[PDB]
Amino acid sequence: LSEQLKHCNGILKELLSKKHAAYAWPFYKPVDASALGLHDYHDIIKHPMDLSTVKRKMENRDYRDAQEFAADVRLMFSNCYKYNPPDHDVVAMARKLQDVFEFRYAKMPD
Ligand SMILES: CCOC(=O)Nc1cc(-c2ccc(C)c(NS(C)(=O)=O)c2)nn2c(C)nnc12
């Protein structure tokens, strides 16, 4: 891990931590469209993403740089904003978790 990717790994640890679990847990595993009845989910969302996938990629040392890590995390959030109306509970949860991500990601030394 580069120093930037070590920083990203620490961010991932925080996003997965009990501190944020009350709004992070819908992002812990891939959206299960069949169980939830999200009929059009895989038509609307071309590239699903979630924290278990980010965690797998980081653990396997698959990210080439910090930008690749950030793109996945933002893809996860953007999918949630794209699929859901603005007043849905899960959009508010996404925003609270993204507050954590964007602030800590911005503090990455460069
Ligand atoms: C028409 C109503 O729209 C929605 O219900 N939307 C969304 C719902 C949930 C969601 C809820 C409850 C549970 C138990 C789960 N679990 S999981 C990760 O296995 O699928 C997920 N996540 N979500 C994400 C991300 N993005 N959108 C949604």
Swiss-Prot record:
Compartments it resides in: Nucleus; Chromosome
Domain Bromo, first and last residues per copy: 1-108
Effect after changing residue 38 to A: Reduced binding to histone H4 acetylated at 'Lys-12' (H4K12ac)
Domain notes: The first bromo domain specifically recognizes histone H4 acetylated at 'Lys-12' (H4K12ac). It also specifically binds histone H4 acetyl-methylated at 'Lys-5' and 'Lys-12' (H4K5acme and H4K12acme, respectively). The second bromo domain recognizes and binds histone H4 acetylated at 'Lys-5' and 'Lys-12' (H4K5ac and H4K12ac, respectively).
Quaternary state and interactors: Homodimer. Interacts with E2F1. Interacts with (acetylated) STAT3; promoting STAT3 recruitment to chromatin. Interacts with CTCF; promoting BRD2 recruitment to chromatin.
Record's miscellaneous remark: Some specific inhibitors of BRD2 that prevent binding to acetylated histone are promising therapeutic molecules for the treatment of cancers or inflammatory diseases. ABBV-744, a small molecule, has been tested on tumors with success: ABBV-744 antiproliferative activity is mainly restricted to cell lines of acute myeloid leukaemia and prostate cancer and is able to displace BRD4 from chromatin. GSK046 (iBET-BD2), which specifically inhibits the second bromo domain, is a promising therapeutic small molecule for the treatment of inflammatory and autoimmune diseases.
Function: Chromatin reader protein that specifically recognizes and binds histone H4 acetylated at 'Lys-5' and 'Lys-12' (H4K5ac and H4K12ac, respectively), thereby controlling gene expression and remodeling chromatin structures. Recruits transcription factors and coactivators to target gene sites, and activates RNA polymerase II machinery for transcriptional elongation.
Family, as annotated: Belongs to the BET family.
Protein name: Bromodomain-containing protein 2
Native species: Homo sapiens
Gene: BRD2
